[PDB]
Structure formats: C-alpha cells, structure tokens
Write a protein that binds this ligand. Structure first.
Ligand SMILES: COC1=C(OC)C(=O)C(C/C=C(/C)CC/C=C(/C)CC/C=C(/C)CC/C=C(\C)CC/C=C(\C)CC/C=C(\C)CC/C=C(/C)CC/C=C(/C)CC/C=C(/C)CCC=C(C)C)=C(C)C1=O
Ligand SMILES: NC(=O)C1=CN([C@@H]2O[C@H](COP(=O)(O)OP(=O)(O)OC[C@H]3O[C@@H](n4cnc5c(N)ncnc54)[C@H](OP(=O)(O)O)[C@@H]3O)[C@@H](O)[C@H]2O)C=CC1
Ligand SMILES: [Zn+2]
Lengths: 460, 115, 125, 96, 208, 342, 86
C-alpha cells in the first residue's frame, strides 16, 4: 500500500494513506497505520560481538566487520549460507546474493516455502497474482484455497468485498470457515475437494466452467504445510481445466498466488531459492541472518560452533542467538525497492535517518565485501539499481504490473512429480482477529498492537 | 538557429582569448597581492591556486558561460587589486581550517549516513 | 546577432553551489498526494521538486533538531513536468519523476441504495 | 510534589531526569537545576467536584473574557465526572 | 458594499486604458501587451530589445513625461523558460501618473543597461546582478553591491537556500575570520500553510 | 557506547563527536590550540581554570552553545579534580610552568599534580588519559625541569597504566616562548651563546602538529599504553637556528660566546624577579642541550600527520618582530638555514 | 567450468525478441526436463534488447546479445553455453 509518512524534527509522527486506485484505493489496514510506534522500541543501534563470557557487548564497525570477514574468508562454498527475512529490500538481497556468490555459495534461502518442483522460480507467472488487485473487479467467480484474505491481505479482501457488493461476485472458500466480511460458499476444508474439482464430479466445477472470466487464488500460507507441491499441482490442474473447457478467453490469467511477505517476491525474482530446506540438508558453518526472525532455524539444526551473523533493525528471536549483530535501517529510513504480490516494484523514500550507528543494509554488505577482499562493483545506490536491472530487469520499472503468461509451461512441468496430498484440513495461521495484529518484528515491538490484542482478547 | 545572442564572444576562440587575458592578469597580480595582504603563502602557492581555480571549470563548452565566468573573474580581480577584499577573503580560497573529507567508500560508511 | 550555440544548457558553474550538493543530491519531481484528512483537492494542481532527506540529529543543549545540509527546506513549484525536468537538467541535478495520479471517474447513483434485488441496497440511512 | 532520582537530581513535572551515566549532568556542576515545584497535576487534583442539577453544564474557566473559550459538558454518564477540556475542573450530577 | 470594500475609480481606469492604447500604437515594434489592473495601475509588457527605446520615449515624449524612475527590480519564476522578469516603475510629475514596464530574460541573455536614460538605474541594475545574476550589457561599473566580497551565488533566487551554503566564525589558530559549511543548531522548520480549498473562484485556471 | 555519546553530524561546530574532554591547563599556549581543535568537531570541553576568568575569555568562541564549561579548581585539592573529571571520558593534562614559583616547585607541577590527576581519573572511570612530558625527560638530566618530567611520567604510568604519553620537543608557534625568546634577545644587542651554539642540535615542532597529534591520539583505539615522540622534520644547530630566526626578523645578528658559568650567573639574576622571569638557569640549561633522538618511539607520521617544517611557519611568528621597513617582506626570500640531518 | 544459473531477458512485444519468445513457447519445457536442477530464470526487458546471462562459479558471469535471433539460433547458443564449448 502507498502511504505518506508524517515526520517532525527527525521523528516519525504518523502514517496516512496515499491514494493509489490500483492497490489500496485510499485505505490502509490497521497494522499499516498503527505499528509505526514499534520503530521506537527494541532498536539495534550499535554493532555487537560476543565477549569472553559469551555476552553481547557493543563494539565498532571496524571490529565487527573484521571479525565477520575473517570468518567468511576461512569458509567457502556450501558451508556459507544466508536467510532473508520478511522486511528486506531488493538492494540488500542482491548485495548479499553477490557477496555469497563470491565465495561460491548458493545456499541463499527465504523463510517462506514455495514449491521448487517443475517450473518453480524460473517462470514469473508461477508465483504471482497475475489477475492483479484491480482485476478482481472484472471477475464473476473467485475461488480461495487455504487462505484468509481478511488478515493476510486486508486491502485485497476489501477489493473482493467491493466487487462482491457492486459486481455481484460469487465467492467460494476451501479451508476453515473463517469470517470474511461478505457471504461466501464454503465447499469444505479437506484438500481432497481440490482433486474432485479437478476431476469434474463436483457441482462447483460446472460453475467454474460456465462462468466467463473466473479467478482461482491460492494463498501462500497453504504452501508451508509439507505438501504444498501437491496443492499447487491440484490448483494448477483446476486452472488448466478451466482454461481448456472454455478455451483461451484472451488475456485473463486465471491462476493466482497471494503472498503475505513483503520481501518474498523480490527474493524469488532474484532467484533466492525459496524455503529453508537447503540449510537443513547441508548445515552451514557461517549463517547470515538478514532480518530472519521467523525462528525457522535455531542452534539445534546447526553444527556446534556455528558462526551466526544477524543484520536487522529490531531485537527479536533472531538476534540473541547470533555471534555478531550489525544494525540495519528500518523501512522508514532508506530508499529501497519492494515488489508487490502482483510483481509491481515500488521504491521507498527516506523519512528519517537510521538511529545511532545503524547503516543502510546494502551499504553494510558492500563494506563487508570490501573488508573481506572481494569488493563489489557498486558504491552508489544508482549502481546497485543498475545491478538489480542486470539480475532482473523488472525490478527497475517502478509502477509497471504488465507481464507475460507462461501458465502452459508451468502446468506442463507441474505434472511430472505427483507426490500425494495429506488428509489434514486446511487451517490458516490467521484464524481470529487477535492473531492479525502481531505478525512481524515491528509489530511485536509495538505497544499499540499489544493494546489491540489485549482489547480483542478480553474486551470489557 | 536557436535565436541566441552572445554577451561578448561570438565563438569559442574569442572566449579562449579572453580567458587567457584574465589568466595573464591574475598571474601578474598574485605577487602584489601576497605583498600587500601580508600573506604567509609563497607566490608559487598563490599562482598554482589560481591555476587550480581556473581548471576547476575547464569542462565548459558554452561560449556564453565562459564569458560570464570571465566577467566574474574580472570582478574578483578588481576586488583584489583595489584591496576591497581583506586577508580573510583571500585566504577563503585555501580552506585552511577545514578537515579533509574522505572520498573512499569505507571511510564514508564509517563516518555517517551521508554518501 | 546569432551565434547558434549547439550545446546542452548547463549553468552549474555559475550558480555558486558546491559540487557536493550537485553530484550527490537526488531531486524528486512529483504532484503531491492529497492530504487524506481533508477532501479539498486544491493542493494537487502544481508539480513540485524537492530534495532527498539527510541526517537530522539532537543538539546537545535544549535537545533541538539540528541539520547540516542547506537544501532541506527547498521546495520548488512548476506548472508542468517538462518545466521541472528542464530546470533540474540545467541545474545539474539527477531527478526521478512520478506521473500524476488522477482519481478515476466513479459511477454514483442515489437510487442504487434502494435496489430491489441487488446487494447495493443499504440497511440504514 | 517533586521526587528525587537515585543520583539526587530533582525530577521535573514532565518526568525528565538524566541517567546515572549521562554526561550532560556536568552542566549542573557548580550550578543548579531549574525545576518548578508547583506540579499542575496535583494542584488540579485537589480541587473539589462541583455538583450541579443539569444534564449539561457550561464552563469558561472563571473570569468571563479572562478564561478559556466557553464549552459545554454532558453529565449523563453516572459512573464518571464531566471534565473540562481546558480548565480541568470536574462536574457531576447529584446521586445517592 | 459600502463600509469595508475599497471603492473603485472608473475615470482613472479609462484614462490609463486610453494611454496604454496610445503607447501601444506608438511603439508596435516592441510592445507585446498592455494591462490595467483593477486598482488602477498600468502595466506594459515589452520585448527585451525595446528597453532603451520605450523608456526613452516614456521619458521624453511631450504627452508622456516620466522623468522619475521609482524602482527597478527583477522577479524569479523558475517554471518559465525566460526565468527573470525585469520591472521598471516610472513616475510622471507633469501628469501625476505612474506606469510600469516589464520584460524578460534568462540566465545567459544580457539586457541593455538604461544608465543613459536614468542615472538612478546605475545602482539598481547592480543590485539585480548581485541578487539574480542578470547581466547588463553596457553598464559603466557593474559589480556586487549588497553581498559579501567573494560571495558565490545569487541569494534572491528561488533555488538558493534561505541560510546559504557557508557561515562565518573567528578561528583562533589562524587568527582570522573563516568561512565553513553551514551547520544550524536548530533547522528552520518548514510550515505547509496552504489550504486545500479554493479561495478565489475568479482566478481559477482552465484544467486544460 | 552510551547513546548520548554517539557521533552525529558532519563534524562541524554544531555536530556531535561523542567526546567529553577535561583539558587541564587549557589557558596556556598548547591548551588554546587543543581546545580549539576539540571545539571544531563539536566535542564537549570542560576547562578547569585557576586564573582570573577574564584570562579565559579567549576560549569562549571556540565552541558552540553549551559545549565549553568553565569550572574552578585547585591543584592541591583532590575534590576539585574529582569534580572536574567526574563526567569526562577523556582527560588531557597540559599543566606545566617553565619557571619555579614560590608556591609551586617543579615537583609540585610535574609530579604531584599529574599523579593526582591520573589517580582521580582512574578512580572516576575515565577511559583515556593523555599526558604531556618532554622529549629530553631524563632522570639524570642536569635540568630539574626534565628530571621532574621523567619522575612524573613514571608516576602517571604507575597510576594510569593505559595512559597515552606524548613527548614533544620545543614547540614553536605564535604564542611560543621558543621562537619569541630568541627574537627577544635583540634588545640586549648581543646574542650570548654557549660555545657559540655550535654543539647544540634542536628539532622544534609546530604547535598545530602537536594539537592534531593529541586529537588523533584521542580517536586512535590502539594508542592506549603507547608513548609518542613529537618532533619536527629537520634538525638544526643552535647557531644556524638563531641565525635563521634573526634573518627572518630582519635584525642584525651579533652572536658572541659566553662561558657556561657566566650564563648560569646571568640566569640566576633574572630569576629573582617577583613576576615571571625572562630567563632562568633551568631555561639556560634546557636551551643549550641537544635534542635526544628516539627511533624506537612512534611519532607524528604514525598518527597520519606530516610534520610542518619550520621554514613554512616561521614568518607567521617572526613578522611581528620586524620593523616597519621590512614588515611587508615575503616568505621565500630568506634562504633557509642548513640542516644537520643524519 | 561449473555453471550455476542461466538468465534469459526477453521483451514481450518488440520484434527482435520474437525468436526468443518462440523458443520459450516451444523448446523450454523439454530443456527444463533435461536440467532439473539448473535455475533458468526467464525475465522481461525494456524495449532496448534481448539478452542471455550465464553465471559460473565464484560469481563470474558473461552475457550474450540475442537480438533478431531465430529459435534455432537461441537454442544453439544456449546448448553451447551449457556444453563445454565457446
Ligand atoms: C615574549 O615573551 C617575552 C617577553 O614578554 C613580552 C619579554 O619581555 C622578554 C624580555 C624583553 C624585555 C622587555 C627587554 C626590553 C627592555 C630591555 C631591558 C632593553 C633596555 C636596555 C637598557 C635599559 C638600554 C639603556 C642604556 C643602558 C646602557 C642602561 C622576553 C625575553 C620574552 O621572551
Ligand atoms: N611550550 C613548549 O615549548 C613545550 C611544552 N611541553 C609541555 O607541554 C605542557 C603545556 O605546554 P605550554 O602550553 O607551552 O605551557 P603553558 O605555560 O603555556 O601552560 C601552562 C598551563 O598550565 C597551568 N598551570 C601551570 N601551573 C599550574 C599550577 N601550579 N596549578 C594549576 N595550573 C597550572 C597554567 O594555568 P594559568 O595560566 O592560569 O596559571 C596554564 O593553564 C606543559 O606541561 C609543557 O611542559 C613540553 C615541551 C615543550
Ligand atoms: Zn474549564
């Protein structure tokens, strides 16, 4: 969502909606509006290392960077790995990718799983919301699979409600009977229904077939349940059956994936190997936690004496388990690139500067590369954006949502491996409004969100 | 075309001629300035400072901009000849009380957020 | 009479700006967004040019907010995007431009509030 | 109603006080710290509650044109006292 | 309408309009536009080449004897291709009237100096050059007048920052006053005072 | 790093360098330069003064609003020393008198006061302590000045183990006693030199170089227990040095040899004055003693500083001693003196 | 020696990318089934030019212009890149 940050005398005072007719349309969600006060708490302001007693103590940039460079020079290849967080910009992502490639490492991962079978990351249409947010006004049938749009993407759910109210949309849900703000048709929560819909026996399948311009939306939250490949294959089969029975209607892009992490699409566009399984199958000796506060990898999944480097802006679960802490900048304190769930890249502007000794993320990575001896070819933000255009050119068009449909190839490659589903009901992580507020690192440090959780839990 | 009118010089050559005249005048004046203002610099220091100030904008290819630069140079020379400038104004060309800002990436990263 | 200069316009050497604030600054050319607290649209008519934000710190006495760059309050107003681009180009600044965001026309109808069979019917007034 | 920090420094009504390791306390060496001892919150707390027989009352701070803009306070809520936005005076409707 | 509204004067409006038409007829080679504002002020917009003729006419013609130059200043409008707008204000004692002459220029185009027409312009033009950077062609002695010695830039320019670029202080090590980059203890606080609602419908511009 | 002590700004007057310095003896010759360099960066300076506050007025414009704080102290009182360094994270010691006075002998000024400062700073938790001694500081030296300097340096090292110690050699500057002292000798009309000054070697150092060395030693992490020798680039014989000094001042040079005993006797006569002595037996001993060479100690070049030669910054000091006739003479028309370099 | 990734940048409306487009339409899937572990990213260019990037070990990477190429040309240079030739 497009916002206006109102600041006074170098302090972020509030967040307001900024009109964008195609994304948020004059509205923002409560988390977008009221979580800004978490930027004043639990901030990482200085570099920190481990002292003789194993405690974290402040140090200078030279000392921490030299220690990290010395650890990085010793290990090369598969022993070096990196994990990206949920609030990471494309510049830092590409800088870390290049730095780890300089030591012949490819163990770059994200905290969210996306199926790597078949086309995987190669085809951009495979992991995007191809219909786009503005396209929901043109559909008449939408099927949501294993997601809760109200909390995972509140503005997307508001768009769905607008289409439902004005265009008489028909909505069906496969998953837990969560309370969307509108009335939908609950087909059930078993994943097996998908196969039935892909078969043709189900009543809903006929509706999809006879309805021109249908939409099928699969939430990313249902791709982390150890069988997301099978669910994705079944949903792609449903989309293919739609595209075949009615033929190609033109440029409609039935298939859709709805993300909930702001750094995921940029990472995938940079080829960042989604999922943390690569770390588990080949444990590393130098771990680069780039804002990774999901708790996916703890010190029990790593070998003894594993050197862990955390680079972020908040003290959270991922911080105190590290050996060196490098203070980065929050999203309000840098001009950075984030890619939408539709693939629309946008850039932030600097509201205030990072507190204390915190620096820009890509600047930290570039300085580390210089100190380690494998200096990177960019010193200016414009040069880093040129590198981004080299790696993936769609990251420098800052309002373009256009793309090409490669659904045929992805569907063809998804048919190769057909690993079975499991008989577990699709349950979204966001079951109740109390789970909506505190979801990421900035929210958990916020006091307003604590008040909101306490109010929605024990109302009175 | 472009319907542009010159200040003094019609082409590049006349502008270069005026530039060389201004350079000769400044080169001549430097020793008298050093004596009158009781500066602690040598004549060679003043002359190479004049050369550096001339070369600071040696990339100009527009005769009008060159003419305006020569006019400003004449203004400064006339200010220095008539002792309208003081010792502080003359020494402001040397930045003697300013710490040298680093130009490499690592020092700038160490110092602050300014690129 | 007419010298017919065939050079791109450039006045960076005449403006007295230090080269630090010419080669390093990044200007932003945009139509400001409407203040969402109000409905008046009179502040979204003209283009504006501004500079990137620099460091502000807390001054040790009185805790006031200090700055070190001179262009922190500089906001210029232009009638058209081409004029702002020309000004930025001739002043040597590197710019980014964002196209104007015009709100699309809507389809309002008072009778739709009382529809016989459509969901747009309101339950209160 | 002033307090004292562990370092022996008076705490102002805004609550500000220098930390133990804060160097800025050196500015008070051989000098004093300016603190106003008449804390406004306690002073307005000791004022009694006015009892009036109306659902809506008006307050202008006292003195007419020498007070604050005249405002109206609704007293229909029973478990709470109407509080003036400007003056801070409290009003209530008779009960019991 | 009576007590608080400024009263209009139609006779002076008619006289000024007639004289503006007279001047425009006499000098068609240079006069581009004529205006009479509603508080009875007459403005003539001319071409830059006509500064010396028009003024001379307005100083010497028997029907128009403007022997006094009240003011001469420039206005900076960055959005225009010709940035600076030169304004001459003339006063006629014989006819007890005032007239205004306007012309335009850019950063590099010089304008003929009018010291031959008016001696008073001698300093005024200097001031313009000091604060706007407009060069006057045949000025007998053109140099900075208001700014400091060796002061770079022209302060009365819309892109010039309010506090400038350098500030002065006495340094004891060198025993003189030195200039250093400006560093304010408290930054000037910018206020956004413009109302989002239109105030005067009469000046509304077409939305193209 | 105590957030309120995190550097901020471009390093200017209003910028914060995160340094809190207590500069003992800031009202002297080196102290003013040190305070000026500290105040340029936006550092907080605490000036302990014992003199008339009027005599500190020249230090007021050196810092921003509230960045220079003046406090009264007593050398023999430990509580004042505790009061003035209780909040500083660096303490610089520049206390020193060139002559002995009736209330403060050389032992008091160079041994007791530095030891007390170091002890109180260690007890107060001060991170860094810069101490200034002499290059010629020897325990066997014939000068009580240098013997006291050596003893006090040993005591400071014993009391503050991580103290940076700096040994300059005959600093010259606008307010120096070294350049002026030789220039001042012209009033007598004959320059008395022991052995014609042909067996004394001097290595004077510029004042700005010493101040920059102190500042860079404050900001250098690996200069805790180190000892630095601050000396100039060139070594001169005393005769040639005085010749160059008189040539720059455009004064007639009439040097004559004076026996050591006679110079000592003359020094004693000057010493009797109630006011500060023009010269003293100690000054005679120090000014006719060759500067020691210590190749095993780091210097200005190890702190990133290129020492300024005397021939570049000598006219700015000696132009005041010229008459009206030569007042406008340039800098590069003196044919600099010969240097006995290795 | 060891290839790590392939990046193909093609514009979706320019004529010079047409052959590349045809390649991805026809002979991409087969390639993906011949290299199941090789990341072959397909991205979109602005109207400038189509290009093919290839990254090797230790961050060394080289680029080839594919302007006005045919589908046979595209597959030929691609199999040259995968093989130990050119
Ligand atoms: C910068 O610091 C210094 C000073 O401070 C400003 C000094 O005064 C100082 C001593 C200089 C004196 C002021 C000497 C000036 C007066 C002299 C005694 C010259 C007078 C000599 C005679 C009286 C000549 C008259 C005839 C005789 C035969 C009797 C020195 C060395 C110094 O270095
Ligand atoms: N000057 C030189 O040539 C070089 C000097 N360095 C050393 O560096 C130090 C400072 O140098 P410099 O600036 O030239 O000397 P100054 O005489 O100019 O400075 C003396 C400072 O120390 C203070 N001070 C002196 N005696 C006492 C005392 N008994 N109690 C309290 N304060 C006192 C003075 O205070 P106040 O003025 O108020 O009396 C004054 O602030 C000295 O220790 C000196 O020995 C050593 C090599 C040579
Ligand atoms: Zn009241």
């Amino acid at each position: 969502s497009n916002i206006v940050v109102s600041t006074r005398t170098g302090e972020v005072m509030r967040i307001l909606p900024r009109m964008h007719e195609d994304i948020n349309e004059e509205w923002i969600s409560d988390k977008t509006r009221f979580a800004y006060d978490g930027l004043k708490r639990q901030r990482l302001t200085q570099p920190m290392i481990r002292n003789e007693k194993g405690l974290l103590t402040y140090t200078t940039w030279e000392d921490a960077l030299s220690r990290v460079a010395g650890m990085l020079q010793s290990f090369q290849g598969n022993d070096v790995a990196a994990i990206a967080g949920g609030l990471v910009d494309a510049e830092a992502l590409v800088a870390l990718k290049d730095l780890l490639n300089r030591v012949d490492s490819d163990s770059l991962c994200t905290e969210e799983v996306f199926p790597t079978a078949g086309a995987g990351t190669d085809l951009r249409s495979n992991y995007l919301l191809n219909t786009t947010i503005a396209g929901v006004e043109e559909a008449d049938v939408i099927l949501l699979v294993g997601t809760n749009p109200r909390f995972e993407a509140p503005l997307f759910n508001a768009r769905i409600r607008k289409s439902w109210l004005h265009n008489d949309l028909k909505v069906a849900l496969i998953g837990s009977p969560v309370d969307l703000t509108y009335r939908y048709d609950h087909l059930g929560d078993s994943p097996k229904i998908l196969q039935d819909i892909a078969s043709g026996n189900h009543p809903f399948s006929q509706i999809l077939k006879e309805a021109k311009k249908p939409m099928v939306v699969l939430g990313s939250s249902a791709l982390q349940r150890s069988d997301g490949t099978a669910i994705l294959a079944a949903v792609s089969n449903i989309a293919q059956n739609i595209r075949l029975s009615s033929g190609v209607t033109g440029d409609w892009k039935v298939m859709n994936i709805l993300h909930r992490i702001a750094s995921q699409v940029a990472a995938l566009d940079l080829g960042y190997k989604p999922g943390v399984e690569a770390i588990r199958k080949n444990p590393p000796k130098v771990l680069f936690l780039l804002g990774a506060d999901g708790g996916c990898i703890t010190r029990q999944d790593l070998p003894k004496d594993c050197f862990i480097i955390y680079q972020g802006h908040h003290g959270d679960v991922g911080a105190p388990m590290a050996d060196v802490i490098l203070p980065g900048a929050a999203y309000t304190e840098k001009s950075a690139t984030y890619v939408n769930t539709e693939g629309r890249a946008q850039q932030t502007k600097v509201a205030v500067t990072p507190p204390g000794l915190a620096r820009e993320d890509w600047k930290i990575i570039r300085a580390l590369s210089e100190i380690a001896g494998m200096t990177l070819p960019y010193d200016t933000l414009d040069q880093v954006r040129s590198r981004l255009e080299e790696v993936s050119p769609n990251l420098v068009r800052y309002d373009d949502v256009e793309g090409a449909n490669y659904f045929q190839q992805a569907n063809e490659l998804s048919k190769l491996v057909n690993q079975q589903l499991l008989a577990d009901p699709l349950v979204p992580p966001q079951l109740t409004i109390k789970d909506f507020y505190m979801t990421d690192s900035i929210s958990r440090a916020s006091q307003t969100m604590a008040k909101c959780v306490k109010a929605v839990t024990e109302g009175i | 075309g472009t319907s542009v009118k010159p200040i003094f010089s019609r082409d590049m050559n006349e502008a270069k001629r005026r530039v060389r005249e201004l350079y000769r005048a400044w080169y001549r004046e430097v020793p008298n300035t050093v004596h009158l203002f009781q500066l602690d610099i040598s004549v060679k220091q003043g002359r190479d400072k004049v050369r550096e100030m001339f070369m600071k904008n040696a990339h100009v290819t527009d005769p009008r901009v060159v003419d305006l630069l020569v006019i400003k140079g004449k203004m400064e020379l006339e200010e220095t000849i008539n002792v309208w400038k003081q010792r502080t104004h003359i020494m402001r060309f040397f930045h003697e009380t300013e710490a040298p800002r680093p130009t490499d990436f690592l020092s700038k990263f160490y110092v602050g957020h300014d690129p | 009479q007419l010298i017919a200069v065939d050079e791109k316009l450039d006045i960076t050497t005449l403006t007295g700006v230090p080269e630090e604030h010419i080669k390093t600054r990044k200007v932003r050319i945009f139509v400001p967004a409407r203040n969402n607290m109000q409905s008046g649209v009179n502040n979204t008519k003209k283009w504006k040019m501004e500079f990137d934000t620099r460091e502000r710190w807390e001054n040790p006495l009185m805790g006031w907010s200090s700055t070190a760059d001179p262009l922190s309050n500089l906001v210029l107003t232009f009638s058209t995007k081409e004029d702002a681009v020309a000004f930025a180009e001739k002043n040597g600044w590197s710019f980014d431009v964002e196209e104007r965001k015009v709100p699309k026309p809507k389809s309002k109808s008072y009778g739709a509030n009382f529809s016989w069979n459509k969901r747009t019917r309101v339950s209160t007034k | 109603g002033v307090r004292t920090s562990p370092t022996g420094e008076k705490v102002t009504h805004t609550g500000q006080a220098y930390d133990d390791g804060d160097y800025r306390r050196v500015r008070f060496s051989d000098r004093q710290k300016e603190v106003n001892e008449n804390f406004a919150i306690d002073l307005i707390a000791e004022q009694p509650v006015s009892e009036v027989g109306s659902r809506v009352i008006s307050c202008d701070g006292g003195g007419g044109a020498l007070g604050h803009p005249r405002v109206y306070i609704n007293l229909d809520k029973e478990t709470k006292t109407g509080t003036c936005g400007y003056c801070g005076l409290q009003f209530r409707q008779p009960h019991h | 309408t009576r007590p608080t509204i400024r009263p209009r004067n139609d006779v002076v409006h008619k006289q000024l309009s007639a004289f503006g038409q007279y001047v425009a007829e006499i000098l068609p080679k240079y006069v581009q536009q004529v205006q009479v504002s509603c508080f009875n002020e007459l403005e003539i917009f001319i071409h830059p080449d006509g500064v010396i003729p028009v003024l001379t006419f307005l100083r010497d013609h028997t029907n128009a004897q403007f022997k006094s130059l009240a003011d001469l200043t420039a206005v900076d409008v960055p959005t225009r291709q010709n940035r600076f707008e030169i304004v001459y204000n003339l006063l006629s004692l014989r006819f007890n009237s005032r007239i205004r002459v306007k012309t335009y220029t850019d950063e590099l185009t010089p304008i003929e100096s009018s010291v031959t027409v008016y001696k008073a312009a001698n300093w005024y033009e200097r001031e313009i050059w000091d604060m706007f950077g407009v060069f006057f062609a045949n000025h007998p002695d053109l140099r900075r007048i208001l700014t400091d010695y060796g002061f770079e830039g022209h302060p009365f320019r819309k892109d010039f920052p309010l506090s400038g670029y350098v500030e002065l202080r006495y340094d004891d090590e060198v025993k003189r006053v030195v200039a250093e980059p400006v560093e304010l203890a408290q930054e000037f606080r910018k206020f956004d005072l413009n109302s989002p609602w239109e105030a005067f419908p009469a000046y509304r511009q077409p939305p193209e | 790093l105590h957030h309120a002590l995190i550097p901020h700004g471009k390093g200017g007057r209003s910028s914060v360098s995160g340094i809190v310095a207590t500069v003992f003896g800031a009202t002297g010759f080196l102290g003013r330069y040190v305070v000026n360099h500290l105040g340029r960066m936006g550092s907080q300076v605490i000036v302990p003064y014992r003199c008339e506050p009027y005599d500190t007025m020249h230090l007021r414009p050196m810092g921003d609003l509230g960045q220079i704080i003046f406090m009264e102290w007593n050398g023999k009182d430990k509580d004042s020393i505790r009061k003035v360094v209780e909040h500083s994270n660096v303490v610089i010691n520049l206390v020193g008198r060139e002559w002995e006075t009736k209330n403060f002998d050389f032992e008091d000024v160079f041994v007791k006061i530095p030891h007390a400062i170091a002890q109180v700073s260690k007890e107060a938790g001060v991170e860094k302590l810069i101490h200034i001694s002499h290059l010629n500081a020897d325990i066997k030296s014939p000068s009580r000045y240098l013997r006291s300097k050596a003893v006090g340096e040993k005591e400071v090292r014993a009391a503050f183990p991580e103290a940076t110690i700096i040994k300059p050699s005959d600093i010259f500057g606008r307010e120096d006693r070294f350049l002026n002292y030789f220039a001042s000798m012209r009033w007598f009309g004959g320059v008395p030199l022991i052995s014609l000054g042909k067996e004394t070697v001097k290595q004077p150092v510029y004042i700005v170089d010493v101040s920059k060395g102190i500042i860079n030693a404050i900001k250098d992490p690996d200069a805790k227990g180190k000892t630095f020798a601050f000396v100039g680039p060139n070594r001169y014989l005393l005769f040639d040095l005085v010749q160059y000094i008189f040539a720059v001042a455009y004064r007639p040079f009439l040097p004559y040899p004076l026996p050591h005993f006679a110079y000592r006797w003359v020094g004693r006569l000057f010493e009797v004055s109630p006011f500060e002595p023009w010269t003293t037996r100690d000054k005679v001993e120090r000014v006719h003693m060759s500067d020691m060479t210590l190749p095993h100690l780091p210097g200005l070049e190890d702190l990133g500083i290129q020492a300024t030669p005397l021939e570049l910054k000598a006219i700015e000091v000696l132009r005041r001693h010229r008459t009206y006739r030569w007042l406008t003479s340039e800098m590069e028309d003196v044919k600099p003196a010969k240097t006995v370099n290795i | 020696l060891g290839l790590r990734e392939i990046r193909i940048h093609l514009c979706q409306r320019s004529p010079g990318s047409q052959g590349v487009r045809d390649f991805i339409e026809k002979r991409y899937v087969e390639l993906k089934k011949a290299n199941p572990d090789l990341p072959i990213l397909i991205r979109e260019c602005s109207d400038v030019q189509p290009k093919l990037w290839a990254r090797y070990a230790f961050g060394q990477e080289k680029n080839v212009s594919l302007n006005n190429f045919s589908a046979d040309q595209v597959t030929r240079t691609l199999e040259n890149v995968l093989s130990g030739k050119a």
